[PDB]
Amino acid sequence: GSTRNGRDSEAKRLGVKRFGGESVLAGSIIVRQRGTKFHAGANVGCGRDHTLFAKADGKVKFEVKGPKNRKFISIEA
Amino acid sequence: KTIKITQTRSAIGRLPKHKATLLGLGLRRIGHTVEREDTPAIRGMINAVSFMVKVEE
RNA sequence: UUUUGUAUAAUGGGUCAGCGACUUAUAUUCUGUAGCAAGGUUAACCGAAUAGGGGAGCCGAAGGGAAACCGAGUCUUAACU
RNA sequence: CCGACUUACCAACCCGAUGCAAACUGCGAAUACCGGAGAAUGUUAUCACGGGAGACACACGGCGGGUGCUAACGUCCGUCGUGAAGAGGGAAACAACCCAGACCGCCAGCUAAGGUCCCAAAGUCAUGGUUAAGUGGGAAACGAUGUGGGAAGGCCCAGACAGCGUCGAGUCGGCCUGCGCGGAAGAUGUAACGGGGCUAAACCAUGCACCGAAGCUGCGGCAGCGACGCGCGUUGUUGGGUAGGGGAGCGUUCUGUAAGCCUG
RNA sequence: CCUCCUAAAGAGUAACGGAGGAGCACGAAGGUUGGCUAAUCCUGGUCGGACAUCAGGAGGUUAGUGCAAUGGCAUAAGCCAGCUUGACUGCGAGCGUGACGGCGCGAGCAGGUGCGAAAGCAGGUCAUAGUGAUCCGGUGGUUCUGAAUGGAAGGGCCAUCGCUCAACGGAUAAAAGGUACUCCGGGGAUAACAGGCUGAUACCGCCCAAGAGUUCAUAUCGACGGCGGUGUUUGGCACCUCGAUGUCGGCUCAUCACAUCCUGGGGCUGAAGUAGGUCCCAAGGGUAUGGCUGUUCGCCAUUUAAAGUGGUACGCGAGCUGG
RNA sequence: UGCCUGGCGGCCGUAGCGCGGUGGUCCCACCUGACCCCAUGCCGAACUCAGAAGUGAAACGCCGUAGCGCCGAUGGUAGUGUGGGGUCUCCCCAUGCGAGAGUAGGGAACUGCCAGGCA
Ligand SMILES: C=C[C@]1(C)C[C@@H](OC(=O)CS[C@H]2C[C@H]3CC[C@@H](C2)N3C)[C@]2(C)[C@H](C)CC[C@]3(CCC(=O)[C@H]32)[C@@H](C)[C@@H]1O
Ligand SMILES: [K+]
Ligand SMILES: [K+]
Ligand SMILES: [K+]
Ligand SMILES: [K+]
Ligand SMILES: [K+]
Ligand SMILES: [K+]
Ligand SMILES: [K+]
Ligand SMILES: [K+]
Ligand SMILES: [K+]
Ligand SMILES: [K+]
Ligand SMILES: [K+]
Ligand SMILES: [K+]
Ligand SMILES: [K+]
Ligand SMILES: [K+]
Ligand SMILES: [K+]
Ligand SMILES: [K+]
Ligand SMILES: [K+]
Ligand SMILES: [K+]
Ligand SMILES: [K+]
Ligand SMILES: [K+]
Ligand SMILES: [K+]
Ligand SMILES: [K+]
Ligand SMILES: [K+]
Ligand SMILES: [Mg+2]
Ligand SMILES: [Mg+2]
Ligand SMILES: [Mg+2]
Ligand SMILES: [Mg+2]
Ligand SMILES: [Mg+2]
Ligand SMILES: [Mg+2]
Ligand SMILES: [Mg+2]
Ligand SMILES: [Mg+2]
Ligand SMILES: [Mg+2]
Ligand SMILES: [Mg+2]
Ligand SMILES: [Mg+2]
Ligand SMILES: [Mg+2]
Ligand SMILES: [Mg+2]
Ligand SMILES: [Mg+2]
Ligand SMILES: [Mg+2]
Ligand SMILES: [Mg+2]
Ligand SMILES: [Mg+2]
Ligand SMILES: [Mg+2]
Ligand SMILES: [Mg+2]
Ligand SMILES: [Mg+2]
Ligand SMILES: [Mg+2]
Ligand SMILES: [Mg+2]
Ligand SMILES: [Mg+2]
Ligand SMILES: [Mg+2]
Ligand SMILES: [Mg+2]
Ligand SMILES: [Mg+2]
Ligand SMILES: [Mg+2]
Ligand SMILES: [Mg+2]
Ligand SMILES: [Mg+2]
Ligand SMILES: [Mg+2]
Ligand SMILES: [Mg+2]
Ligand SMILES: [Mg+2]
Ligand SMILES: [Mg+2]
Ligand SMILES: [Mg+2]
Ligand SMILES: [Mg+2]
Ligand SMILES: [Mg+2]
Ligand SMILES: [Mg+2]
Ligand SMILES: [Mg+2]
Ligand SMILES: [Mg+2]
Ligand SMILES: [Mg+2]
Ligand SMILES: [Mg+2]
Ligand SMILES: [Mg+2]
Ligand SMILES: [Mg+2]
Ligand SMILES: [Mg+2]
Ligand SMILES: [Mg+2]
Ligand SMILES: [Mg+2]
Ligand SMILES: [Mg+2]
Ligand SMILES: [Mg+2]
Ligand SMILES: [Mg+2]
Ligand SMILES: [Mg+2]
Ligand SMILES: [Mg+2]
Ligand SMILES: [Mg+2]
Ligand SMILES: [Mg+2]
Ligand SMILES: [Mg+2]
Ligand SMILES: [Mg+2]
Ligand SMILES: [Mg+2]
Ligand SMILES: [Mg+2]
Ligand SMILES: [Mg+2]
Ligand SMILES: [Mg+2]
Ligand SMILES: [Mg+2]
Ligand SMILES: [Mg+2]
Numbered sequence A: 001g002s003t004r005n006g007r008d009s010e011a012k013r014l015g016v017k018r019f020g021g022e023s024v025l026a027g028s029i030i031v032r033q034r035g036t037k038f039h040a041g042a043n044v045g046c047g048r049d050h051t052l053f054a055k056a057d058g059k060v061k062f063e064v065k066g067p068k069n070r071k072f073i074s075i076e077a
Numbered sequence B: 001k002t003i004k005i006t007q008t009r010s011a012i013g014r015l016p017k018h019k020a021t022l023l024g025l026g027l028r029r030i031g032h033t034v035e036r037e038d039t040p041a042i043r044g045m046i047n048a049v050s051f052m053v054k055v056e057e
Numbered sequence C: 001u002u003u004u005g006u007a008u009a010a011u012g013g014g015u016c017a018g019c020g021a022c023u024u025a026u027a028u029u030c031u032g033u034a035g036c037a038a039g040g041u042u043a044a045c046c047g048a049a050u051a052g053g054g055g056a057g058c059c060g061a062a063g064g065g066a067a068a069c070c071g072a073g074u075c076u077u078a079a080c081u
Numbered sequence D: 001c002c003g004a005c006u007u008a009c010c011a012a013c014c015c016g017a018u019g020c021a022a023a024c025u026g027c028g029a030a031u032a033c034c035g036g037a038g039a040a041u042g043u044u045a046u047c048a049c050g051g052g053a054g055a056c057a058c059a060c061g062g063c064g065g066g067u068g069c070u071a072a073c074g075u076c077c078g079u080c081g082u083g084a085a086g087a088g089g090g091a092a093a094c095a096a097c098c099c100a101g102a103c104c105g106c107c108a109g110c111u112a113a114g115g116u117c118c119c120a121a122a123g124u125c126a127u128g129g130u131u132a133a134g135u136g137g138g139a140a141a142c143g144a145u146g147u148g149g150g151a152a153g154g155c156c157c158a159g160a161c162a163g164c165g166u167c168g169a170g171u172c173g174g175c176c177u178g179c180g181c182g183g184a185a186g187a188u189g190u191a192a193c194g195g196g197g198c199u200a201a202a203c204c205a206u207g208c209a210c211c212g213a214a215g216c217u218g219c220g221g222c223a224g225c226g227a228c229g230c231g232c233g234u235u236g237u238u239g240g241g242u243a244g245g246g247g248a249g250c251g252u253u254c255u256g257u258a259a260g261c262c263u264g
Numbered sequence E: 001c002c003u004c005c006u007a008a009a010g011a012g013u014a015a016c017g018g019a020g021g022a023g024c025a026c027g028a029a030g031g032u033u034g035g036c037u038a039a040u041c042c043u044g045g046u047c048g049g050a051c052a053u054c055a056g057g058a059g060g061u062u063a064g065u066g067c068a069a070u071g072g073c074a075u076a077a078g079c080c081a082g083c084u085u086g087a088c089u090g091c092g093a094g095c096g097u098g099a100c101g102g103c104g105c106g107a108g109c110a111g112g113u114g115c116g117a118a119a120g121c122a123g124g125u126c127a128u129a130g131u132g133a134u135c136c137g138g139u140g141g142u143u144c145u146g147a148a149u150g151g152a153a154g155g156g157c158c159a160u161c162g163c164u165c166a167a168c169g170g171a172u173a174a175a176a177g178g179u180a181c182u183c184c185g186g187g188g189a190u191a192a193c194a195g196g197c198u199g200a201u202a203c204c205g206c207c208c209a210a211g212a213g214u215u216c217a218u219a220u221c222g223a224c225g226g227c228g229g230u231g232u233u234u235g236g237c238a239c240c241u242c243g244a245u246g247u248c249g250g251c252u253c254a255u256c257a258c259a260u261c262c263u264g265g266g267g268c269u270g271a272a273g274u275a276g277g278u279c280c281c282a283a284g285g286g287u288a289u290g291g292c293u294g295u296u297c298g299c300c301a302u303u304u305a306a307a308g309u310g311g312u313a314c315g316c317g318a319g320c321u322g323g
Numbered sequence F: 001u002g003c004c005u006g007g008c009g010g011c012c013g014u015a016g017c018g019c020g021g022u023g024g025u026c027c028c029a030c031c032u033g034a035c036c037c038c039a040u041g042c043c044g045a046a047c048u049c050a051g052a053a054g055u056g057a058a059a060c061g062c063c064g065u066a067g068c069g070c071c072g073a074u075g076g077u078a079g080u081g082u083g084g085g086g087u088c089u090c091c092c093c094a095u096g097c098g099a100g101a102g103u104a105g106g107g108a109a110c111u112g113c114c115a116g117g118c119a
Helices: B016-025 B040-048
Strands: A029-032 A038-040 A044-046 A052-054 A058-065 A070-076 B002-007 B033-037 B053-056
Touching: A038 A044, A044 A070, B002 B040, B016 B040
Parallel strands: A038 A070
Antiparallel strands: A029 A052, A044 A052, A058 A070, B002 B033, B002 B053
């Protein structure tokens, strides 16, 4: 007859906006994410929704770093 | 060195990327022979559409 | 004709002849073309006058601001890097 | 107040083995996507802005899936192809499959898919095999000394196997595999190769011929776009199209040109 | 509106697909400084037990997160305390995401502030739901405007308030039904009939053989399961027909299939005979009348060698009937 | 220049555990006391301060040792882009890419700056 499902939320367009080696202007969003899947490295800020954004003009650099092998995003300015 | 490349089959029904490659080689129709420089870039194009071109080398 | 798709057993037409469907007015924008050009153009009307007169107006040469207002600036803001 | 033996016994944790997962992941591709660089090639194929739209019923096929019965020529997504809006050749006939994109003409040529005994264009082609079922040319579990190939065994002239010690040569049944057989009943008429017919004219392998399209080439012609030269030449390339956009024309009636011009 | 999966390792991606949540909460549950680290179990211990609190150890986040799910989180984003109001005002390089309206992220600048010795951090909260355009009107501020002039009214601007407008891009401030008395424009874009595709279901075969059959699976039957065939019931789908493809049953007239009811041939039998059972071959011909009911069917009566089963637009209304 | 110790990094398990040693001159640790500075939702346990008699017991560092964790070929397998094929619910062929798991094996980290002790 009827079903109790049939709901879903709008897709949030998360994920990587600027990949490795891409030249960005300061302020450019590099990744939108839920929590810190990626962490802010050098010249990268972490917004209130865990958005990583460039704090300097330069090139995006993904790196695995530290004792937990966490993924950091940096900007090579 | 230059290589002669002849188109042997139709582009009709081929993938867009394959049509783009034939355009990249400058092949216009079945039987059209073009003379191109033997470079890795040209060889990769041939490789991508090797089923529908013949290389005389 | 309509359709994803019609020989279709979907639609329409018995045939011929004649008639039968994107117009007209005004406004507005764009294009072309012609005139004149930081100007362009007149409306009613007058004029027997397609002339000539009539520049009332309209558009343009300045914008910004809700506005007062300021003005190659202006608004925003107590003030802008 | 307790305890102690005790179980057809039911048993968590932990340990060792075994699987399973769209909403599991201590792993993790191919692809795809984003960015950078470099050639060649491509009628700028790109982006922006402005004039004009149409369209917002899609269909099938392939691949990845949800749903459904991994039912539907079903339904709903993703992605590519074709149809739509695409003729030609093939698939008997057959939008959507295969081949292939029709500017025009030719009583030239070469090919594609697909074919070559007759209908019907081209091999009654070659070589080696398989099938005997018209299998080919509809159908499963399963059944069976059909028949071909391969590897390996048991037993055997100290006589095996079958028949009745005799008898003198092989016998026995598993394995893997090729092709067949049964399983296999439907309604107008053969009617489940398109038909004739076929024992290859079937199937497999190999090879060389040929046929075969509106594909390609040849010859002649027309037009669009772009170069490079001086509207002309030379040269490159393009010309299937519905909605629809753009360009250029034909003819009709009427007005001027026209008291002209044609007309008993 | 949010979260996951479907979703094909960028984004996005449908279904009356599979699962759950939201329409808030919080002046601390916000800011900052300083500090801290979980579940669970084992051993011991007043009451005290499986589980309270205490002590030690094992363990290592298997906890926790104001509330779903996912992704995060130890430098914790988790837990505790001090001081606080950055849950600041004006702006904003740049970027994400949207058809748009919008929505989001944001360093930095100015002013003023909190916490910290300081570097610093703070424009709410681990993040992602907790929402409502415009109009109309309300309240406070602001001489911006003020229809002769000065005022004022009203308007503007800034701040803010009023919607389960939840059918949530929100037709109106304000709205239920009937039509077999019906009507128009349309559609085979879409149902009812028949056809088609399909074959779950149905019907008919077959495979395995537990077992029943005194004994004995296979005379006969065939549990648990397995594989097909037909197009044949109930359905699924919506491809043909809505500028009409007349419909149940009967009557008349049929025609084909064979899965055979009778008659014909045959094997097996748990076949003495008679008469059966079962299977194979066989479609030549044959194959009830009545009672009841619109019935088809069915039950009943009485026949018959038998009273077959199906297909044919559930054969047959330009052939009849009209229950 | 070697050996030891401390601090701060690189790196983020070949680097971590376990298990057997081993070190006190120096350094480190525990340690010794607390009217003090500061501290305990109780407690000088911690934090903090004033110290140096004692011990390396614990911890810590170092060394050894595969029982683990960890790393890990080669080959094969799975998957898969493109093209092609079949008996098409699934496969196969050509070509390109090629895991995961497991196997052999590796494996008791390595390294920069500064300071101090010793030789
Ligand atoms: C009018 C249509 C009729 C004569 C009858 C029709 O039956 C119906 O449509 C049932 S509704 C019924 C039909 C007529 C007209 C009004 C009233 C209602 N009643 C007297 C009926 C049985 C079908 C169900 C639909 C298709 C039909 C063709 C074939 C068929 O069996 C017909 C149509 C196309 C036919 O023209
Ligand atoms: K960006
Ligand atoms: K139609
Ligand atoms: K009709
Ligand atoms: K106009
Ligand atoms: K003009
Ligand atoms: K400005
Ligand atoms: K598809
Ligand atoms: K096409
Ligand atoms: K045959
Ligand atoms: K707080
Ligand atoms: K500030
Ligand atoms: K609505
Ligand atoms: K009404
Ligand atoms: K059967
Ligand atoms: K028996
Ligand atoms: K109809
Ligand atoms: K009949
Ligand atoms: K019998
Ligand atoms: K008969
Ligand atoms: K009918
Ligand atoms: K009737
Ligand atoms: K009729
Ligand atoms: K009649
Ligand atoms: Mg989501
Ligand atoms: Mg880390
Ligand atoms: Mg239709
Ligand atoms: Mg046709
Ligand atoms: Mg038809
Ligand atoms: Mg017709
Ligand atoms: Mg006809
Ligand atoms: Mg019609
Ligand atoms: Mg007609
Ligand atoms: Mg102005
Ligand atoms: Mg629509
Ligand atoms: Mg649509
Ligand atoms: Mg679609
Ligand atoms: Mg599919
Ligand atoms: Mg469909
Ligand atoms: Mg399908
Ligand atoms: Mg159409
Ligand atoms: Mg065609
Ligand atoms: Mg054709
Ligand atoms: Mg044909
Ligand atoms: Mg030839
Ligand atoms: Mg011939
Ligand atoms: Mg021969
Ligand atoms: Mg046959
Ligand atoms: Mg067979
Ligand atoms: Mg027949
Ligand atoms: Mg030809
Ligand atoms: Mg041609
Ligand atoms: Mg063409
Ligand atoms: Mg054309
Ligand atoms: Mg005239
Ligand atoms: Mg995605
Ligand atoms: Mg993807
Ligand atoms: Mg889409
Ligand atoms: Mg906090
Ligand atoms: Mg909080
Ligand atoms: Mg939260
Ligand atoms: Mg109003
Ligand atoms: Mg006044
Ligand atoms: Mg007044
Ligand atoms: Mg709505
Ligand atoms: Mg009507
Ligand atoms: Mg339809
Ligand atoms: Mg029907
Ligand atoms: Mg049906
Ligand atoms: Mg449909
Ligand atoms: Mg029909
Ligand atoms: Mg009609
Ligand atoms: Mg029979
Ligand atoms: Mg007969
Ligand atoms: Mg006879
Ligand atoms: Mg009767
Ligand atoms: Mg009937
Ligand atoms: Mg009948
Ligand atoms: Mg009648
Ligand atoms: Mg009739
Ligand atoms: Mg009646
Ligand atoms: Mg102490
Ligand atoms: Mg010790
Ligand atoms: Mg590996
Ligand atoms: Mg060790």
